[PDB]
Design a protein around this ligand. Structure first.
Ligand SMILES: CCCCCCCCCCCCCCCCCC(=O)O[C@H](COC(=O)CCCCCCCCCCCCCCC)COP(=O)(O)OCC[N+](C)(C)C
Ligand SMILES: CCCCCCCCCCCCCCCCCC(=O)O[C@H](COC(=O)CCCCCCCCCCCCCCC)COP(=O)(O)OCC[N+](C)(C)C
Ligand SMILES: *[C@@H]1O[C@H](CO)[C@@H](O[C@@H]2O[C@H](CO)[C@@H](O[C@@H]3O[C@H](CO)[C@@H](O)[C@H](O)[C@@H]3O)[C@H](O)[C@H]2NC(C)=O)[C@H](O)[C@H]1NC(C)=O
Ligand SMILES: CC(C)=CCC/C(C)=C/CC/C(C)=C/CC/C(C)=C\CC1=C(C)C(=O)c2ccccc2C1=O
Ligand SMILES: *[C@@H]1O[C@H](CO)[C@@H](O[C@@H]2O[C@H](CO)[C@@H](O)[C@H](O)[C@H]2NC(C)=O)[C@H](O)[C@H]1NC(C)=O
Ligand SMILES: *[C@@H]1O[C@H](CO)[C@@H](O[C@@H]2O[C@H](CO)[C@@H](O)[C@H](O)[C@H]2NC(C)=O)[C@H](O)[C@H]1NC(C)=O
Ligand SMILES: CC(C)CCC[C@@H](C)[C@H]1CC[C@H]2[C@@H]3CC=C4C[C@@H](O)CC[C@]4(C)[C@H]3CC[C@]12C
Lengths: 665, 32
């Protein structure tokens, strides 16, 4: 009927389980599935040395390193460095087998298990694209993607140009739609709609055409935010329907190319570019091969019509077998779970914090931008009682713990187990972290008065020591920007919102001369700790602050107060004046001369970087990528030899390591 | 570098190491 030509199936095919399973296991062309499989395998092969961390395993999983790691399950621990290299080797072999369709089921498992082990090993490495890679591997494990353009077809029949169940394409297309649509629904957030998430992205030269017609402020709203939201919302619908598939392909390809050249998101854009032709006809690669403008189809895969495969249900009775029922059930359950998981944060409230859920599985890319002003990790020794302070992120290899109560709890537990080594036993560790999400007032995300080490965190309970994001102060942001615009090139402002009963102890460095605090809303008592002087501020009152001395801003209002710090960094200002004097002296022609020389060298380097021709920057990029891949391979070989043939002498290990890190050119 | 003194730990107005616009999606080059 009309829906049959529009949806690719009939309503009668959803009448019962038999009809639905016959539909989902309908014989489809394996060509598009195979091409996506090859592209995904190739992109994962390239992604393993770059994003996964094969080129930085020795810097990450170094043995003997005292490091706070953030696994999803605290019982999940990394293997020794050599065994981590073996795990990455297995992942690489699995990705290569997926790319070539060689031992496809085994290769899919060999990529899937190490990939998800690494993914769950660190919650701070989670991205929406990394989660997408894991999802695509999980699906492609159960798909017959080796039925075309694969070595599995060259090695054994019944898989060479053989039909695949329709549910393979159904699940892949459903996953891609889900990514697009749930991305759009997450971008329905007020910060994205109002233009707050990425208002500095339109400054990129790639947005120059729109700047011809739209202003910079209008380009960021209409094109980056409204355009991006509209693209995400309508991408799946455009790609699905045939009449709009061409325009949807063009729009989606433009979106992904721009995202590839705008963000360092690894292979995300290329993965979605490869996934876009999944919505096309399954025989599109077969059509391209059949065209053969250069008559190169001998090297290209088979162009003949696919052979019948037992994976599909052929209408004739031919009732579906168990594998077809499992395929249909997998399609339904997997798509339901993929629609539900981005919205399952009502269940796992221990990961909610400000932005609900762990980052990585909600398709909320680039919606929430965080700017952290300060992080104070206070500790109190349980035996001595002496108060001490830690370097923020001292033992962490990432900084995501600053935004998550789960990762903060893990960090505090790791600190409580490590700090006895550094003479601090039974540490009561408090975290005072100031975060501003989407250009809001900087405010504490966690309670600074609570000992996280002993604080209660549960995976399914809302965290009591997470400070609520002051959304009622969101309208202030516009005014904030005005203030930021009113300042000079030598003046800086920090906008701080503090909760009642909480105080901000701030040491203004001696460099920051001419610093002042202006109360924007509420009331704050500023205490000159050094002078022990209390001054209550009214809304709009400006108080000068002493440099090189402590001061404590207590929020005495019943409601959260808002103030700003206007500081100049007058040491740098005097340095600039002296540098201008030196510049005038040079034009007429100790430490200040050294600073002038350093500034001149920096300017010369900046000029030289732009002076590099586009072929030179590209060749530098190729050399950097070649070095990364070579180092990955060589350290992998070192660790594999250490595992099979044993670790050689320390001198020989040093020689091999210094050979691995040697630049190719 | 594990520990900080009272002054340096309470330096809120200290300039951050870099312009903070973290998106949690862009891969941090050399995060290790
Ligand atoms: C009653 C009891 C028995 C039934 C219970 C379950 C009821 C139904 C549950 C849902 C079942 C959905 C099965 C969909 C399978 C399917 O059609 O596979 C795919 C669709 O699989 C998908 O998940 C679609 C991708 C996302 C599309 C989003 C926009 C459109 C949504 C509506 C159509 C789906 C179609 O393959 P095709 O080769 O037939 O191409 C058709 C499209 N054209 C012709 C335009 C190129
Ligand atoms: C047709 C249907 C399908 C449609 C879609 C098709 C496209 C799908 C994907 C196909 C493959 C695309 C490859 C993409 C490669 C890639 O990711 O590019 C790069 C990665 O490039 C690579 O991995 C390629 C290098 C591989 C290793 C080195 C190989 C050799 C280098 C060249 C030789 C050097 C020495 C020569 C002799 C002197 C992205 O890198 P990045 O994350 O640093 O991003 C840089 C840009 N910024 C920072 C702005 C984000
Ligand atoms: C206030 O302005 C002064 C500028 O006079 C800032 O101090 C200067 O900060 C820079 C780095 O931001 C220092 O440069 C580097 O210092 C490190 C540590 O010694 C080292 O890698 C090099 O020596 C390099 O030069 C610089 O030394 C330092 N001092 C001076 C006199 O320039 C200060 O950070 C500003 N205050 C705030 C709160 O921003
Ligand atoms: C309104 C109008 C005139 C439109 C027509 C003409 C316009 C201006 C066309 C559309 C080009 C724009 C300008 C497209 C989007 C820019 C976007 C910056 C960001 C968000 C975003 C990023 C960064 C990702 O990496 C990503 C990855 C995977 C899935 C989703 C996403 C995602 O969503
Ligand atoms: C401390 O810094 C502030 C801000 O940089 C200075 O305030 C400026 O005062 C002049 C005086 O007319 C105004 O024209 C500017 O518009 C002000 N800048 C602002 C409000 O951002 C203040 O003068 C400085 N104090 C000293 C002693 O130099
Ligand atoms: C300045 O005022 C603040 C509050 O307006 C004082 O902070 C309180 O100090 C007492 C000690 O006498 C504590 O018991 C309270 O818990 C503090 N309130 C807080 C932390 O919100 C501060 O002591 C005053 N300082 C001076 C020098 O007058
Ligand atoms: C040592 C361990 C961690 C390695 C073994 C790999 C196991 C745990 C992996 C392999 C496949 C993975 C699953 C693949 C896909 C999904 C769907 C997604 O929406 C949630 C995660 C979930 C459900 C994954 C959970 C973890 C998983 C089951």
């Amino acid at each position: 009927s009309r829906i049959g030509k529009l949806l690719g199936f009939e309503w009668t095919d959803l009448s019962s389980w038999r009809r639905l399973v016959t539909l989902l296991n309908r014989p489809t062309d394996p060509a598009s599935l195979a091409v996506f499989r090859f592209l995904f395998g190739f992109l994962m092969v390239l992604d393993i040395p770059q994003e996964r961390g094969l080129s930085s395993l020795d810097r990450k999983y170094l043995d003997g390193l005292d490091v706070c790691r953030f696994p999803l399950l605290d019982a999940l621990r990394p293997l020794p460095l050599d065994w981590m290299y073996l795990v990455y080797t297995i992942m690489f072999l699995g990705a290569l087998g997926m790319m070539l369709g060689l031992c496809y089921r085994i290769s899919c498992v060999l990529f899937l298990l190490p990939y998800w082990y690494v993914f769950l090993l660190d919650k701070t490495s989670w991205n929406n694209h990394s989660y997408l890679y894991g999802l695509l591997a999980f699906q492609l494990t159960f798909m017959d993607a080796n039925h075309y353009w694969s070595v599995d077809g060259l090695l054994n029949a019944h898989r060479r140009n053989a039909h695949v169940p329709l549910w393979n394409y159904a699940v892949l297309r459903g996953q891609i739609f889900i990514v697009y649509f749930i991305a759009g629904v997450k971008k329905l957030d007020a910060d994205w709609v109002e233009g707050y998430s990425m208002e500095y992205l339109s400054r990129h030269w790639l947005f120059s055409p729109f700047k011809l017609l739209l202003s910079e402020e209008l380009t960021s709203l209409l094109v980056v935010h409204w355009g991006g939201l509209l693209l995400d919302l309508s991408a799946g619908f455009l790609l699905f329907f045939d009449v709009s598939r061409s325009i949807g392909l063009f729009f989606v390809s433009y979106f992904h190319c721009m995202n590839s050249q705008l963000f360092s998101i690894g292979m995300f854009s290329y993965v979605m570019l490869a996934s876009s032709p999944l919505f096309c006809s399954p025989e599109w690669p077969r059509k391209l091969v059949s065209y053969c403008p250069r008559r190169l189809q001998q090297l290209l895969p088979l162009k003949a019509a696919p052979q019948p495969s037992v994976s599909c249900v052929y209408k004739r009775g031919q009732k579906p077998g168990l594998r077809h029922q499992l395929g249909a059930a997998f399609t339904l359950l997997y798509l339901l779970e993929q629609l539900f998981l981005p919205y399952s944060h009502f269940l796992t409230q221990g990961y909610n914090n400000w932005t609900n859920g762990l980052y990585g599985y909600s398709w909320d890319m680039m919606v929430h931008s965080r700017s952290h002003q300060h992080v104070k990790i206070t500790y109190r020794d349980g035996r001595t009682g002496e108060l001490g302070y830690l370097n923020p992120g001292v033992f962490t290899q990432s900084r995501r713990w600053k935004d998550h109560a789960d990762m903060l709890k893990q960090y505090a537990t790791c600190l409580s187990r490590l700090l006895p080594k550094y003479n601090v036993t039974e540490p009561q560790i408090y975290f005072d972290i100031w975060v501003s999400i989407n250009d809001r007032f900087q405010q504490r995300i966690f309670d600074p008065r609570v000992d996280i080490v002993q604080a209660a965190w549960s995976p399914f309970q809302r965290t009591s020591w997470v400070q609520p994001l002051l959304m009622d102060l969101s309208p202030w942001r516009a005014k904030l920007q005005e203030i930021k615009s009113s300042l000079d090139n030598h003046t800086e402002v920090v906008f701080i919102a503090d909760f009642p009963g909480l105080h901000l102890e701030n040491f203004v460095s001696e460099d920051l001369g001419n610093t002042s605090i202006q109360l924007l809303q509420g009331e704050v008592t500023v205490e000159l700790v050094a002078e022990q002087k209390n001054q209550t501020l009214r809304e709009g009152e400006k108080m000068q602050l002493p440099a090189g001395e402590y001061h404590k801003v207590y929020t005495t209002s019943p409601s959260p107060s808002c103030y700003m710090y206007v500081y100049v960094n007058t040491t740098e200002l005097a340095l600039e004046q002296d540098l201008a004097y030196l510049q005038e002296l040079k034009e007429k022609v100790t430490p200040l001369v050294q600073t002038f020389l350093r500034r001149q060298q920096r300017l010369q380097e900046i000029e030289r970087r732009r002076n590099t021709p586009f072929h030179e920057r590209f060749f530098r990029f190729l050399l950097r990528k070649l070095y990364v891949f070579r180092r990955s391979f060589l350290m992998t070989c070192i660790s594999l030899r250490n595992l099979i043939l044993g670790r050689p002498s320390l001198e020989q290990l040093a020689q091999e390591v210094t050979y691995a890190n040697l630049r190719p050119f | 570098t594990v520990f900080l003194d009272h002054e340096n730990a309470n330096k809120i107005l200290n300039r951050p190491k870099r312009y903070n616009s973290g998106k949690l999606e862009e891969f941090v080059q050399g995060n290790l």
